Amino acid sequence: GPLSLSVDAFKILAAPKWEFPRKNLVLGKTLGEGEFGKVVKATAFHLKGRAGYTTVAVKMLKENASPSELRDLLSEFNVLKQVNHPHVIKLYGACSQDGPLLLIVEYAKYGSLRGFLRESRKVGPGPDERALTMGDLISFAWQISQGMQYLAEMKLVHRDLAARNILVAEGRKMKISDFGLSRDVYEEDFYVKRSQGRIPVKWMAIESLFDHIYTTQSDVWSFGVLLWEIVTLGGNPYPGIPPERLFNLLKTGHRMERPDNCSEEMYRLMLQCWKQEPDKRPVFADISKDLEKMMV
Ligand SMILES: Nc1ncnc2c1ncn2[C@@H]1O[C@H](CO)[C@@H](O)[C@H]1O
Secondary structure: OHHHHHHHHHHHOOOOOOEOOHHHEEEEEEEEEOOOEEEEEEEEEEEOOEEEEEEEEEEEEOOOOOHHHHHHHHHHHHHHOOOOOOOEOOEEEEEOOOOOOEEEEEOOOOOEHHHHHHHHOOOOOEOOEOOOOHHHHHHHHHHHHHHHHHHHHOOEEOOOOOHHHEEEEOOOEEEEOOOOOOEEOOOOOOEEOOOOOOOOHHHOOHHHHHHOEEOHHHHHHHHHHHHHHHHOOOOOOOOOOOHHHHHHHHHOOOOOOOOOOOOHHHHHHHHHHOOOOHHHOOOHHHHHHHHHHOOO
């Protein structure tokens, strides 16, 4: 099948620019389990010319992986070789032979954006008094917008943009991650999937949910939901609404209401990302500019 060809090709290939000796990698605690597999903290000796040990993260298959999970791992590997941007998680290498496949990536010290925002709720007296300033939250959104503009410029649809898939690294810098589901879109400008997708329902654009069409403009939809997560410090979208109810809810034009601690200007941006007609939504270059207007 397609996967056996991919596995067979990937094994035959050498790729010295990315192979890393397994003996030079030491794995540590688990940082979390996502889709495709788990992530652990690790340290790497003599990595990409860096003398001594470097702290890294390691993406590997989970126990009892399926073909779909193995395909996502290889698909994330292949995508990460092609991208290089300050707000996109960085690949350092991989371990293929004499053991299970490991992807070595930049370590993000603060973890996922969602967890970082939820943890910030515990700082201070209570919900009516936050520890992150609105200006800090806008900066995060802007940083992510810049990374998406870059990914769109090279014809990649991320498909899975959400706070759980954004990493916060040294200096509170945003790093887009979780590229297992992203798809190259150079030829046609869209990606279509016949099967039911594995993106959470509550982040999917209405044309991806009904018609299975993914484009840069459905990425903008998800970015609109991401803005909602950020502004709510990691809230859960469409609270109390079962995912199965979203089909009818979105079809009839309903959208999430303006949340607490959200300016009217920021809400106008959210709603524009959720327009039913994809071409009526802004492009990421315009989202960046609109976020800049909110900066002081
Ligand atoms: N480079 C990384 N650095 C730190 N934590 C990560 C990294 N990649 C994934 N994770 C963690 O694993 C999960 C995403 O796979 C999240 O819980 C996140 O905290």
